């Protein structure tokens, strides 16, 4: 998360605005690329072409 916060912006209001997103992501137990990829795949529909 430190990378993402550094990478969005280091101004105080920036972290203030971005805090709810971090709280939301910590609400779920996503801490690994595998977990988030699984979550996305669940949220991705079979728009079969």
């Amino acid at each position: 998360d430190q990378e993402i916060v550094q990478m969005i912006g280091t101004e105080e209001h920036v972290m203030a605005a971005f805090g709810p997103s971090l709280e939301e992501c910590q609400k779920a137990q996503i801490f690994t690329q595998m977990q988030a990829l699984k979550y996305i795949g669940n949220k991705v529909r079979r728009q079969r072409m």
Binding site: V5, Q6, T10, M15
Partner: protein, 146 residues
């Protein structure tokens, strides 16, 4: 309580959240402070232009990429600190311009990977990287030259 294993503040220049109770430099200032005030040798990291003003010496070349690797040992360039803070790098006939890179505040350590054996290697940290330099051709000089 341990003073060196503390938690971090977001601002790197103000990392020390709790107490025991910054200027932005230019090449002329940087080299002046690191030579005159301090005699200690320092590790720098610089980005050269894509191609150097030379030709690969019998390296099977087409004006291909003449990088730092293709050159040889010995004196290779001259660094001139001009008045009014101007800093240049005379590299023979051409004069590159040297500037501050982005001031990285995180940890950059220059290591050596000495593959002494096929399955053994010497990880040799050499020193921290404090400043980053950028070298670019003075295209204005090249243009008004011709």
């Amino acid at each position: 309580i341990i003073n060196i294993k503390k938690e971090k503040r977001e601002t790197d220049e103000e990392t020390k959240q709790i107490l025991r109770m910054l200027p932005k430099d230019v090449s002329v200032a940087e080299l002046l402070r690191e030579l005159s005030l301090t005699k200690e040798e320092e590790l720098l990291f610089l980005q050269l232009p894509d191609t150097l003003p030379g030709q690969p010496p019998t390296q099977d070349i087409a004006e291909n990429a003449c990088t730092l690797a293709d050159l040889t040992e010995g004196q290779v360039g001259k660094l001139l600190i001009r008045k009014s803070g101007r800093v240049q790098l005379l590299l023979g006939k051409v004069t590159l311009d040297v500037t501050m890179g982005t001031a990285c505040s995180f940890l950059q350590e220059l290591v050596s990977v000495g593959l002494g054996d096929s399955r053994t290697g010497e990880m040799t940290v050499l020193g921290h990287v404090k400043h980053k330099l950028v070298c670019s051709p003075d295209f204005e000089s090249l243009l008004d030259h011709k």
